[PDB]
């Protein structure tokens, strides 16, 4: 019954642009942050580890310093959105979205990057 | 040379517990998601449990959630399934599988050979071996043993062609039964020796029955 | 997510092309659909992942296609080694699920079974039970019928049957049927008969024996 979903399971983006990939999860009325965990991963790197209302930057891979953000206001709407700025060719590959809010689930997303 | 080897299976009575283990080789074990998949005798494949590289996340099928616990040790190159509160429908061959790629996007890359878990009230018991006496057909009736498996050969492996060792059937009693047959020339009756070799490892018994015409 | 494989069995000759279907009750995320091959007594081997990519070392007569909820596995120009049970599996969405399998069986010329009947050994009778066995040897196709008659009375609920896997050389099947009785019930009757029908028989084969003779 608790299910993480993906509007798009595939993204195709231009080199150098911005991108926001989305994982959705069910929220009824108001969202309690204490109960909520969000992970975004890419390959063996950690992009986002959101626990206790806070992103944990000491666990974050340094490749992603300055360019990666979980969009906080989108969370109330049951949408774990990951904004990555200045997209490079190395950003291409399979991403993972884990969300725990009572129950827990995860999904994968593929990002493809065209060069010019 | 990816390798996977399961251990720890056997017989256990209902409500009891058992711990399966899986050893890995030929790849960096700490880099991969790992699964358990099971298969009941004659049925198809059913996924059971999942674990992340660091053991930080674990997922289960409904049927085992609350009863089975998956865990792993990256240092030992080993995967574990602690099974508790076991029912008869948990009877199956249990396989370990590597989920390939970073997050499992290469599906089940590689499998172990599996280990049989048998859940039943019956006690281990060696087979009775009865002659099926006689182109002629002869054989051995291997009856009332528990649990699986049993090993059948003829003339110590020196007789192979025309040999049919049937899959065992679970009898009404809950004990296993099977027969092994072989077709031979009628002329070979009397001049040729035919010995049925039965080996049931669980009950640690070995039997050699000579089958003759009556 | 429920996967319905189709059909149940394929009967084909080497060199023919095989088409296997997998339908899903939901869209399979990113098309994460695997196919697997299983031979009797062995663990599964991965064939196709991401619906269309061959696993490593898998020969190119194995080809995957489809998307969304409808997936196909094609084996063109089958080799003898390709006859097995095939499974599809979805890994796009938890819980991972498998379809019920498809068996691809070698279709050969029709072959009639040799039929034998075996009386209970004297050694067995001291156990209180009597087992009567009926062997059906080397037939094709797999579908074979066995009726049991004690003194020309039909039997129900006291028989069990077992079938071999398709033969390595022959491509045939064999069958055993075991009729179990009390020693007391057994010694009350005279004629034990095993009656067999099969596509390869133009008349029924009955093997019998008389108790004591």
Short mmCIF file of C-alpha atoms in Angstrom, two decimals:
data_model
loop_
_atom_site.label_atom_id
_atom_site.label_comp_id
_atom_site.label_asym_id
_atom_site.label_seq_id
_atom_site.Cartn_x
_atom_site.Cartn_y
_atom_site.Cartn_z
CA UNK A 1 0.00 0.00 0.00
CA UNK A 2 2.88 2.37 0.75
CA UNK A 3 4.48 2.91 -2.63
CA UNK A 4 7.14 5.23 -4.00
CA UNK A 5 6.29 6.24 -7.57
CA UNK A 6 8.01 7.95 -10.45
CA UNK A 7 6.15 10.21 -12.89
CA UNK A 8 9.10 9.71 -15.20
CA UNK A 9 11.41 6.71 -15.02
CA UNK A 10 13.56 8.26 -17.74
CA UNK A 11 15.04 11.74 -18.10
CA UNK A 12 16.83 13.14 -21.18
CA UNK A 13 18.63 16.41 -20.53
CA UNK A 14 21.03 18.81 -22.20
CA UNK A 15 24.54 19.17 -20.91
CA UNK A 16 24.93 22.24 -18.70
CA UNK A 17 21.25 22.69 -17.90
CA UNK A 18 19.32 22.16 -14.70
CA UNK A 19 17.20 19.11 -13.88
CA UNK A 20 14.73 18.12 -11.20
CA UNK A 21 13.91 14.45 -10.82
CA UNK A 22 10.91 13.39 -8.72
CA UNK A 23 9.93 10.57 -6.40
CA UNK A 24 6.38 10.65 -5.11
CA UNK A 25 5.07 9.14 -1.89
CA UNK A 26 1.62 9.31 -0.20
CA UNK A 27 1.02 12.09 2.36
CA UNK A 28 -2.32 12.64 4.09
CA UNK A 29 -2.91 16.14 5.50
CA UNK A 30 0.19 17.48 7.30
CA UNK A 31 3.67 15.94 6.95
CA UNK A 32 5.52 14.99 10.16
CA UNK A 33 9.26 15.37 9.53
CA UNK A 34 10.38 13.18 12.45
CA UNK A 35 8.93 10.09 10.81
CA UNK A 36 10.45 10.85 7.39
CA UNK A 37 13.64 9.59 5.72
CA UNK A 38 14.72 10.42 2.14
CA UNK A 39 17.75 8.99 0.32
CA UNK A 40 18.91 9.92 -3.16
CA UNK A 41 21.83 7.89 -4.50
CA UNK A 42 23.73 7.76 -7.79
CA UNK A 43 26.00 4.78 -8.42
CA UNK A 44 27.89 4.28 -5.12
CA UNK A 45 27.71 7.96 -4.13
CA UNK A 46 25.20 9.52 -1.74
CA UNK A 47 23.53 12.71 -2.97
CA UNK A 48 20.87 13.33 -0.34
CA UNK A 49 20.34 11.96 3.13
CA UNK A 50 17.38 13.74 4.70
CA UNK A 51 16.71 12.85 8.33
CA UNK A 52 14.99 14.80 11.10
CA UNK A 53 14.05 17.78 8.89
CA UNK A 54 17.66 18.24 7.87
CA UNK A 55 19.98 17.26 5.05
CA UNK A 56 23.16 15.65 6.37
CA UNK A 57 26.09 17.13 4.44
CA UNK A 58 28.83 15.13 6.15
CA UNK A 59 27.55 11.98 4.46
CA UNK A 60 27.10 13.76 1.14
CA UNK A 61 29.56 12.96 -1.65
CA UNK A 62 31.72 16.06 -2.42
CA UNK A 63 31.01 15.78 -6.15
CA UNK A 64 27.60 17.09 -5.26
CA UNK A 65 28.52 19.90 -2.96
CA UNK A 66 26.95 23.15 -4.28
CA UNK A 67 24.95 21.47 -7.09
CA UNK A 68 22.43 19.21 -5.34
CA UNK A 69 19.30 20.17 -3.41
CA UNK A 70 16.27 18.41 -2.05
CA UNK A 71 13.40 20.85 -2.56
CA UNK A 72 11.87 21.16 0.91
CA UNK A 73 8.50 22.78 0.17
CA UNK A 74 7.71 20.02 -2.35
CA UNK A 75 7.84 17.46 0.48
CA UNK A 76 4.47 18.48 2.00
CA UNK A 77 2.95 17.43 -1.31
CA UNK A 78 4.49 13.96 -1.12
CA UNK A 79 7.09 14.83 -3.70
CA UNK A 80 10.78 14.22 -3.06
CA UNK A 81 12.26 16.43 -5.75
CA UNK A 82 16.00 16.47 -6.46
CA UNK A 83 17.32 19.55 -8.21
CA UNK A 84 20.77 19.21 -9.73
CA UNK A 85 22.29 22.29 -11.30
CA UNK A 86 24.77 22.57 -14.19
CA UNK A 87 24.28 19.00 -15.40
CA UNK A 88 27.44 17.29 -16.61
CA UNK A 89 27.92 14.11 -18.67
CA UNK A 90 29.01 12.27 -15.49
CA UNK A 91 25.48 12.84 -14.12
CA UNK A 92 24.16 10.26 -16.62
CA UNK A 93 23.21 6.92 -15.16
CA UNK A 94 20.81 5.25 -12.75
CA UNK A 95 19.56 7.10 -9.70
CA UNK A 96 17.92 5.68 -6.58
CA UNK A 97 15.12 7.23 -4.50
CA UNK A 98 14.38 5.74 -1.05
CA UNK A 99 11.52 7.12 1.06
CA UNK A 100 10.40 6.02 4.52
CA UNK A 101 7.24 7.51 6.00
CA UNK A 102 5.57 4.84 8.12
CA UNK A 103 6.12 2.23 5.44
CA UNK A 104 9.10 2.32 3.10
CA UNK A 105 9.89 1.78 -0.57
CA UNK A 106 12.32 2.78 -3.33
CA UNK A 107 12.51 3.30 -7.06
CA UNK A 108 15.13 3.82 -9.73
CA UNK A 109 15.38 6.58 -12.32
CA UNK A 110 17.53 6.75 -15.44
CA UNK A 111 19.11 10.03 -16.51
CA UNK A 112 20.46 10.46 -20.05
CA UNK A 113 22.60 13.43 -21.11
CA UNK A 114 23.08 14.73 -24.64
CA UNK A 115 26.47 16.37 -25.23
CA UNK A 116 25.80 19.42 -27.36
CA UNK B 1 34.26 -16.30 -11.84
CA UNK B 2 31.39 -15.21 -9.61
CA UNK B 3 30.53 -18.02 -7.17
CA UNK B 4 27.66 -18.51 -4.72
CA UNK B 5 27.25 -21.38 -2.23
CA UNK B 6 24.33 -21.93 0.18
CA UNK B 7 24.57 -23.89 3.43
CA UNK B 8 22.46 -24.56 6.49
CA UNK B 9 19.35 -26.24 5.11
CA UNK B 10 17.66 -29.42 6.26
CA UNK B 11 14.67 -30.68 8.25
CA UNK B 12 12.94 -28.61 10.92
CA UNK B 13 9.52 -29.08 12.52
CA UNK B 14 6.74 -26.46 12.31
CA UNK B 15 7.09 -23.41 14.54
CA UNK B 16 10.84 -24.06 14.62
CA UNK B 17 13.76 -21.97 13.43
CA UNK B 18 16.66 -22.29 11.01
CA UNK B 19 19.48 -20.09 9.74
CA UNK B 20 20.60 -20.20 6.11
CA UNK B 21 23.94 -18.92 4.95
CA UNK B 22 25.41 -17.99 1.59
CA UNK B 23 29.10 -17.56 0.76
CA UNK B 24 30.28 -15.38 -2.14
CA UNK B 25 33.40 -15.27 -4.28
CA UNK B 26 34.82 -13.65 -7.43
CA UNK B 27 33.35 -10.19 -6.96
CA UNK B 28 33.40 -7.39 -4.42
CA UNK B 29 30.59 -8.48 -2.11
CA UNK B 30 30.25 -5.13 -0.32
CA UNK B 31 29.29 -3.46 -3.64
CA UNK B 32 26.12 -5.41 -4.31
CA UNK B 33 22.51 -5.80 -3.26
CA UNK B 34 21.73 -9.44 -2.43
CA UNK B 35 18.45 -11.45 -2.55
CA UNK B 36 16.94 -14.67 -1.36
CA UNK B 37 14.64 -16.53 -3.78
CA UNK B 38 12.86 -19.81 -2.98
CA UNK B 39 11.16 -22.59 -4.90
CA UNK B 40 8.74 -25.13 -3.51
CA UNK B 41 8.97 -28.71 -4.94
CA UNK B 42 7.32 -28.70 -8.37
CA UNK B 43 6.29 -25.06 -8.13
CA UNK B 44 7.77 -21.88 -9.55
CA UNK B 45 10.08 -19.17 -8.22
CA UNK B 46 9.23 -16.74 -5.42
CA UNK B 47 11.35 -13.79 -4.23
CA UNK B 48 11.80 -13.66 -0.43
CA UNK B 49 14.09 -10.93 0.92
CA UNK B 50 16.46 -8.12 -0.01
CA UNK B 51 19.40 -6.35 1.59
CA UNK B 52 21.38 -3.17 0.77
CA UNK B 53 25.23 -3.18 0.55
CA UNK B 54 25.65 -1.83 4.07
CA UNK B 55 22.74 -3.78 5.60
CA UNK B 56 21.01 -0.44 6.07
CA UNK B 57 17.75 -1.43 4.31
CA UNK B 58 15.89 -4.75 4.14
CA UNK B 59 12.74 -5.75 2.25
CA UNK B 60 10.53 -8.82 2.44
CA UNK B 61 7.58 -10.52 0.81
CA UNK B 62 4.34 -10.28 2.86
CA UNK B 63 4.47 -14.04 3.75
CA UNK B 64 7.75 -13.82 5.66
CA UNK B 65 7.58 -10.27 6.98
CA UNK B 66 7.82 -10.50 10.75
CA UNK B 67 9.21 -14.05 10.66
CA UNK B 68 12.30 -14.02 8.44
CA UNK B 69 15.25 -11.72 9.04
CA UNK B 70 17.82 -11.05 6.32
CA UNK B 71 21.34 -9.90 7.23
CA UNK B 72 24.88 -9.89 5.80
CA UNK B 73 28.56 -9.64 6.74
CA UNK B 74 30.71 -7.93 4.15
CA UNK B 75 33.95 -8.90 5.88
CA UNK B 76 33.01 -12.63 5.84
CA UNK B 77 31.61 -12.41 2.29
CA UNK B 78 28.40 -13.92 3.58
CA UNK B 79 24.63 -13.57 3.47
CA UNK B 80 22.17 -14.87 6.02
CA UNK B 81 18.53 -15.66 6.40
CA UNK B 82 17.28 -16.28 9.90
CA UNK B 83 14.00 -18.11 9.54
CA UNK B 84 11.72 -18.30 12.59
CA UNK B 85 8.18 -19.51 13.19
CA UNK B 86 8.41 -21.80 10.13
CA UNK B 87 5.25 -23.22 8.51
CA UNK B 88 4.89 -26.19 6.13
CA UNK B 89 4.45 -23.84 3.13
CA UNK B 90 7.94 -22.57 3.81
CA UNK B 91 9.21 -25.94 2.48
CA UNK B 92 11.37 -25.16 -0.56
CA UNK B 93 14.76 -24.98 -2.20
CA UNK B 94 16.28 -21.69 -1.11
CA UNK B 95 18.55 -19.79 -3.57
CA UNK B 96 20.79 -16.81 -2.96
CA UNK B 97 21.11 -14.31 -5.82
CA UNK B 98 23.28 -11.30 -6.57
CA UNK B 99 21.42 -8.26 -7.80
CA UNK B 100 23.75 -6.88 -10.48
CA UNK B 101 24.77 -3.26 -11.04
CA UNK B 102 24.62 -0.56 -8.36
CA UNK B 103 20.99 -0.88 -7.26
CA UNK B 104 20.05 -4.18 -8.85
CA UNK B 105 19.32 -2.84 -12.34
CA UNK B 106 20.96 -5.92 -13.90
CA UNK B 107 18.41 -8.18 -12.18
CA UNK B 108 19.54 -11.54 -10.73
CA UNK B 109 23.04 -11.85 -12.23
CA UNK B 110 24.18 -15.03 -10.52
CA UNK B 111 22.64 -17.75 -8.35
CA UNK B 112 23.86 -20.32 -5.85
CA UNK B 113 22.89 -23.98 -6.36
CA UNK B 114 20.34 -23.83 -3.56
CA UNK B 115 19.75 -25.73 -0.34
CA UNK B 116 16.58 -27.69 0.51
CA UNK B 117 14.57 -26.70 3.56
CA UNK B 118 12.02 -29.23 4.71
CA UNK B 119 9.34 -28.28 7.24
CA UNK B 120 7.39 -31.21 8.66
CA UNK B 121 6.43 -33.14 11.80
CA UNK B 122 7.85 -36.39 10.49
CA UNK B 123 11.11 -37.73 11.87
CA UNK B 124 14.11 -38.66 9.80
CA UNK B 125 13.71 -42.27 8.69
CA UNK B 126 15.65 -44.60 6.39
CA UNK B 127 13.94 -46.23 3.38
CA UNK B 128 12.69 -49.77 2.96
CA UNK B 129 13.98 -51.22 -0.29
CA UNK B 130 11.89 -53.80 -2.08
CA UNK B 131 12.70 -55.70 -5.29
CA UNK B 132 10.55 -55.10 -8.39
CA UNK B 133 11.10 -58.50 -9.99
CA UNK B 134 10.77 -59.35 -13.75
CA UNK B 135 13.00 -57.13 -23.26
CA UNK B 136 12.53 -57.20 -19.47
CA UNK B 137 12.03 -54.48 -16.86
CA UNK B 138 13.21 -54.63 -13.25
CA UNK B 139 13.86 -52.31 -10.34
CA UNK B 140 13.78 -51.22 -6.71
CA UNK B 141 10.96 -49.91 -4.58
CA UNK B 142 12.46 -47.30 -2.24
CA UNK B 143 9.73 -46.72 0.34
CA UNK B 144 8.89 -44.64 3.46
CA UNK B 145 11.97 -42.46 3.85
CA UNK B 146 12.28 -38.90 5.22
CA UNK B 147 13.41 -36.43 4.26
CA UNK B 148 14.55 -35.93 0.72
CA UNK B 149 16.92 -36.61 -0.92
CA UNK B 150 17.81 -40.17 -1.78
CA UNK B 151 20.53 -41.49 -4.10
CA UNK B 152 19.91 -44.37 -6.49
CA UNK B 153 22.46 -46.08 -8.68
CA UNK B 154 22.76 -49.48 -10.38
CA UNK B 155 25.73 -51.83 -10.18
CA UNK B 156 27.67 -48.99 -8.58
CA UNK B 157 27.26 -46.69 -11.56
CA UNK B 158 28.25 -49.37 -14.04
CA UNK B 159 24.64 -49.54 -15.25
CA UNK B 160 23.15 -46.36 -16.74
CA UNK B 161 21.43 -46.92 -20.07
CA UNK B 162 17.71 -47.47 -19.79
CA UNK B 163 17.62 -46.38 -16.15
CA UNK B 164 14.67 -44.35 -14.89
CA UNK B 165 14.72 -43.17 -11.29
CA UNK B 166 11.36 -41.49 -10.79
CA UNK B 167 10.90 -38.32 -8.75
CA UNK B 168 9.67 -39.15 -5.25
CA UNK B 169 6.02 -38.62 -4.28
CA UNK B 170 4.94 -37.38 -0.87
CA UNK B 171 2.66 -40.17 0.39
CA UNK B 172 -0.51 -39.77 2.44
CA UNK B 173 1.60 -40.70 5.48
CA UNK B 174 3.92 -37.73 4.95
CA UNK B 175 6.81 -40.07 4.08
CA UNK B 176 8.49 -40.21 0.67
CA UNK B 177 8.37 -43.06 -1.80
CA UNK B 178 9.95 -43.76 -5.21
CA UNK B 179 10.99 -46.48 -7.64
CA UNK B 180 13.99 -46.93 -9.90
CA UNK B 181 13.62 -49.08 -13.00
CA UNK B 182 15.77 -50.31 -15.82
CA UNK B 183 15.00 -52.24 -19.00
CA UNK B 184 17.31 -55.10 -19.88
CA UNK B 185 17.42 -58.02 -22.36
CA UNK B 186 15.51 -61.10 -21.12
CA UNK B 187 18.64 -63.13 -21.85
CA UNK B 188 20.55 -61.14 -19.22
CA UNK B 189 18.28 -62.45 -16.46
CA UNK B 190 20.32 -65.03 -14.58
CA UNK B 191 23.69 -64.32 -16.18
CA UNK B 192 23.86 -60.60 -15.37
CA UNK B 193 23.92 -59.29 -11.78
CA UNK B 194 21.61 -56.37 -11.02
CA UNK B 195 22.20 -54.54 -7.74
CA UNK B 196 20.19 -51.48 -6.71
CA UNK B 197 22.29 -49.05 -4.67
CA UNK B 198 20.30 -46.84 -2.32
CA UNK B 199 21.91 -44.09 -0.30
CA UNK B 200 19.87 -41.87 2.04
CA UNK B 201 22.22 -39.34 3.61
CA UNK B 202 19.84 -37.75 6.17
CA UNK B 203 19.22 -41.10 7.93
CA UNK B 204 22.80 -42.10 7.08
CA UNK B 205 21.76 -45.49 5.65
CA UNK B 206 23.11 -47.31 2.57
CA UNK B 207 21.39 -50.32 0.99
CA UNK B 208 22.36 -52.81 -1.72
CA UNK B 209 19.45 -54.93 -2.98
CA UNK B 210 20.07 -57.67 -5.54
CA UNK B 211 17.07 -58.03 -7.83
CA UNK B 212 16.47 -61.47 -9.32
CA UNK B 213 13.62 -63.20 -11.12
CA UNK B 214 11.34 -65.30 -8.87
CA UNK C 1 2.29 -6.87 -9.75
CA UNK C 2 1.11 -10.14 -11.27
CA UNK C 3 2.90 -11.64 -14.28
CA UNK C 4 0.98 -14.09 -16.46
CA UNK C 5 3.19 -16.17 -18.72
CA UNK C 6 1.88 -17.79 -21.85
CA UNK C 7 1.47 -20.43 -22.96
CA UNK C 8 1.90 -23.24 -20.44
CA UNK C 9 3.84 -25.61 -22.67
CA UNK C 10 5.50 -25.32 -26.08
CA UNK C 11 6.10 -28.47 -28.13
CA UNK C 12 8.66 -27.68 -30.84
CA UNK C 13 11.35 -29.32 -32.98
CA UNK C 14 14.95 -28.08 -32.98
CA UNK C 15 15.36 -25.33 -35.56
CA UNK C 16 11.87 -23.96 -35.03
CA UNK C 17 11.36 -20.52 -33.49
CA UNK C 18 9.85 -20.14 -30.00
CA UNK C 19 7.76 -17.17 -28.81
CA UNK C 20 7.07 -16.66 -25.10
CA UNK C 21 4.69 -14.14 -23.59
CA UNK C 22 4.71 -12.25 -20.32
CA UNK C 23 1.85 -9.90 -19.40
CA UNK C 24 1.83 -7.62 -16.35
CA UNK C 25 -1.03 -6.24 -14.25
CA UNK C 26 0.87 -2.96 -13.93
CA UNK C 27 3.39 -0.97 -15.93
CA UNK C 28 6.90 -2.28 -15.24
CA UNK C 29 9.05 0.70 -14.25
CA UNK C 30 12.01 1.40 -16.56
CA UNK C 31 11.14 -1.90 -18.33
CA UNK C 32 13.01 -3.90 -15.69
CA UNK C 33 11.87 -7.29 -16.95
CA UNK C 34 14.23 -10.25 -16.71
CA UNK C 35 13.94 -13.69 -18.30
CA UNK C 36 15.39 -16.90 -16.84
CA UNK C 37 16.10 -20.43 -17.96
CA UNK C 38 15.84 -23.39 -15.65
CA UNK C 39 16.76 -27.00 -16.35
CA UNK C 40 15.56 -29.82 -14.02
CA UNK C 41 17.54 -29.99 -10.79
CA UNK C 42 19.48 -26.77 -11.51
CA UNK C 43 19.23 -23.12 -10.40
CA UNK C 44 17.95 -20.51 -12.91
CA UNK C 45 20.28 -18.77 -15.40
CA UNK C 46 19.69 -15.11 -16.35
CA UNK C 47 18.97 -14.65 -20.05
CA UNK C 48 17.63 -11.16 -20.65
CA UNK C 49 17.55 -8.05 -18.49
CA UNK C 50 15.98 -4.63 -19.17
CA UNK C 51 13.64 -6.61 -21.41
CA UNK C 52 15.94 -6.61 -24.45
CA UNK C 53 19.60 -6.93 -23.34
CA UNK C 54 21.33 -10.31 -23.33
CA UNK C 55 23.09 -11.39 -20.13
CA UNK C 56 26.78 -12.17 -20.56
CA UNK C 57 27.64 -15.19 -22.69
CA UNK C 58 23.98 -15.75 -23.59
CA UNK C 59 23.86 -16.65 -27.29
CA UNK C 60 22.13 -14.29 -29.72
CA UNK C 61 19.27 -16.62 -30.68
CA UNK C 62 17.86 -15.41 -27.35
CA UNK C 63 16.13 -12.12 -27.96
CA UNK C 64 13.89 -9.95 -25.85
CA UNK C 65 11.36 -7.30 -26.73
CA UNK C 66 8.37 -5.43 -25.36
CA UNK C 67 7.71 -2.50 -23.03
CA UNK C 68 5.23 -1.44 -20.37
CA UNK C 69 2.96 -4.40 -19.61
CA UNK C 70 3.63 -6.72 -22.57
CA UNK C 71 6.87 -8.65 -22.98
CA UNK C 72 8.13 -11.29 -25.40
CA UNK C 73 11.09 -13.70 -25.36
CA UNK C 74 12.03 -15.20 -28.69
CA UNK C 75 14.25 -18.18 -29.28
CA UNK C 76 14.82 -18.43 -33.00
CA UNK C 77 16.28 -21.65 -34.43
CA UNK C 78 16.12 -23.69 -31.19
CA UNK C 79 19.01 -25.96 -30.21
CA UNK C 80 18.44 -29.13 -28.10
CA UNK C 81 20.12 -27.39 -25.14
CA UNK C 82 17.39 -24.71 -25.19
CA UNK C 83 14.60 -26.96 -24.00
CA UNK C 84 13.79 -26.03 -20.41
CA UNK C 85 11.40 -24.03 -18.25
CA UNK C 86 11.48 -20.27 -18.83
CA UNK C 87 10.54 -17.61 -16.28
CA UNK C 88 10.01 -13.89 -16.54
CA UNK C 89 10.47 -11.56 -13.57
CA UNK C 90 9.82 -7.94 -12.78
CA UNK C 91 12.40 -6.03 -10.70
CA UNK C 92 11.06 -2.53 -11.31
CA UNK C 93 8.80 -2.40 -8.26
CA UNK C 94 8.79 -4.08 -4.83
CA UNK C 95 7.95 -6.84 -4.16
CA UNK C 96 9.93 -8.49 -7.00
CA UNK C 97 7.66 -11.02 -8.68
CA UNK C 98 7.96 -14.03 -11.00
CA UNK C 99 5.54 -15.43 -13.53
CA UNK C 100 4.47 -19.09 -13.29
CA UNK C 101 6.80 -20.33 -16.01
CA UNK C 102 6.57 -21.78 -19.50
CA UNK C 103 7.93 -25.21 -20.45
CA UNK C 104 9.49 -25.63 -23.93
CA UNK C 105 9.43 -29.38 -24.72
CA UNK C 106 10.99 -31.25 -27.69
CA UNK C 107 8.24 -32.45 -30.04
CA UNK C 108 9.11 -35.86 -31.48
CA UNK C 109 7.26 -38.62 -33.27
CA UNK C 110 4.51 -40.29 -31.30
CA UNK C 111 5.76 -43.29 -29.32
CA UNK C 112 3.76 -45.99 -27.55
CA UNK C 113 4.72 -47.03 -24.01
CA UNK C 114 6.01 -50.50 -23.13
CA UNK C 115 3.92 -51.62 -20.18
CA UNK C 116 5.03 -53.76 -17.25
CA UNK C 117 3.30 -54.74 -14.02
CA UNK C 118 5.03 -55.71 -10.77
CA UNK C 119 3.48 -57.68 -7.90
CA UNK C 120 4.40 -56.93 -4.25
CA UNK C 121 7.57 -58.62 -2.97
CA UNK C 122 7.11 -61.19 -0.20
CA UNK C 123 9.47 -59.06 1.88
CA UNK C 124 7.09 -56.13 1.63
CA UNK C 125 3.99 -58.06 2.68
CA UNK C 126 5.39 -58.55 6.21
CA UNK C 127 5.13 -54.77 6.61
CA UNK C 128 1.36 -55.02 6.32
CA UNK C 129 1.08 -53.00 3.11
CA UNK C 130 1.19 -54.26 -0.48
CA UNK C 131 2.51 -52.04 -3.26
CA UNK C 132 1.51 -52.88 -6.82
CA UNK C 133 3.59 -51.05 -9.43
CA UNK C 134 2.91 -50.35 -13.12
CA UNK C 135 5.67 -49.02 -15.35
CA UNK C 136 4.98 -47.05 -18.52
CA UNK C 137 8.23 -46.85 -20.40
CA UNK C 138 9.53 -44.44 -23.05
CA UNK C 139 6.42 -42.81 -24.55
CA UNK C 140 5.50 -39.55 -26.25
CA UNK C 141 3.54 -37.35 -25.82
CA UNK C 142 3.50 -36.98 -22.04
CA UNK C 143 -0.27 -37.41 -21.69
CA UNK C 144 -0.91 -41.01 -20.59
CA UNK C 145 -3.86 -42.57 -18.74
CA UNK C 146 -3.65 -45.36 -16.12
CA UNK C 147 -6.67 -47.19 -14.69
CA UNK C 148 -6.34 -49.77 -11.86
CA UNK C 149 -8.62 -52.84 -11.62
CA UNK C 150 -8.71 -55.34 -8.77
CA UNK C 151 -10.83 -58.30 -9.90
CA UNK C 152 -12.21 -56.00 -12.63
CA UNK C 153 -13.34 -53.36 -10.13
CA UNK C 154 -12.15 -49.77 -10.76
CA UNK C 155 -9.94 -48.11 -8.12
CA UNK C 156 -10.11 -44.61 -6.60
CA UNK C 157 -7.97 -42.81 -4.02
CA UNK C 158 -5.38 -45.55 -3.51
CA UNK C 159 -3.10 -44.68 -6.47
CA UNK C 160 -0.18 -42.34 -6.97
CA UNK C 161 1.71 -41.54 -10.16
CA UNK C 162 5.09 -40.06 -11.03
CA UNK C 163 6.56 -38.85 -14.32
CA UNK C 164 10.19 -38.53 -15.44
CA UNK C 165 11.62 -35.42 -17.08
CA UNK C 166 11.94 -35.63 -20.87
CA UNK C 167 14.78 -38.00 -21.74
CA UNK C 168 18.24 -36.72 -22.70
CA UNK C 169 18.59 -39.04 -25.70
CA UNK C 170 15.06 -40.28 -26.58
CA UNK C 171 13.05 -37.11 -25.87
CA UNK C 172 10.52 -39.52 -24.35
CA UNK C 173 8.72 -39.69 -20.98
CA UNK C 174 8.21 -42.56 -18.52
CA UNK C 175 5.65 -43.09 -15.79
CA UNK C 176 5.17 -45.20 -12.63
CA UNK C 177 1.80 -45.82 -10.95
CA UNK C 178 1.65 -47.28 -7.46
CA UNK C 179 -1.45 -48.94 -6.07
CA UNK C 180 -1.23 -49.35 -2.29
CA UNK C 181 -3.33 -51.79 -0.22
CA UNK C 182 -3.53 -53.61 3.10
CA UNK C 183 -1.98 -57.06 3.15
CA UNK C 184 -5.45 -58.12 4.31
CA UNK C 185 -7.19 -56.37 1.38
CA UNK C 186 -4.62 -57.72 -1.10
CA UNK C 187 -5.00 -61.39 -0.11
CA UNK C 188 -8.77 -61.09 -0.48
CA UNK C 189 -8.53 -60.70 -4.25
CA UNK C 190 -7.13 -62.60 -7.24
CA UNK C 191 -6.64 -60.44 -10.33
CA UNK C 192 -4.57 -57.27 -10.35
CA UNK C 193 -4.78 -55.36 -13.62
CA UNK C 194 -3.24 -52.13 -14.95
CA UNK C 195 -4.99 -50.59 -17.97
CA UNK C 196 -3.28 -48.03 -20.21
CA UNK C 197 -4.50 -45.60 -22.90
CA UNK C 198 -2.25 -43.31 -24.93
CA UNK C 199 -2.21 -41.60 -28.36
CA UNK C 200 0.31 -44.16 -29.59
CA UNK C 201 -1.97 -47.13 -28.84
CA UNK C 202 -4.75 -48.20 -31.23
CA UNK C 203 -6.06 -50.65 -28.65
CA UNK C 204 -5.81 -50.58 -24.87
CA UNK C 205 -2.82 -52.31 -23.27
CA UNK C 206 -3.63 -54.25 -20.08
CA UNK C 207 -1.00 -56.09 -18.09
CA UNK C 208 -2.30 -58.38 -15.32
CA UNK C 209 -1.24 -61.08 -12.88
CA UNK C 210 -3.01 -63.53 -10.57
CA UNK C 211 -2.12 -63.56 -6.89
CA UNK C 212 -0.24 -66.75 -6.08
CA UNK C 213 0.31 -67.69 -9.70
#
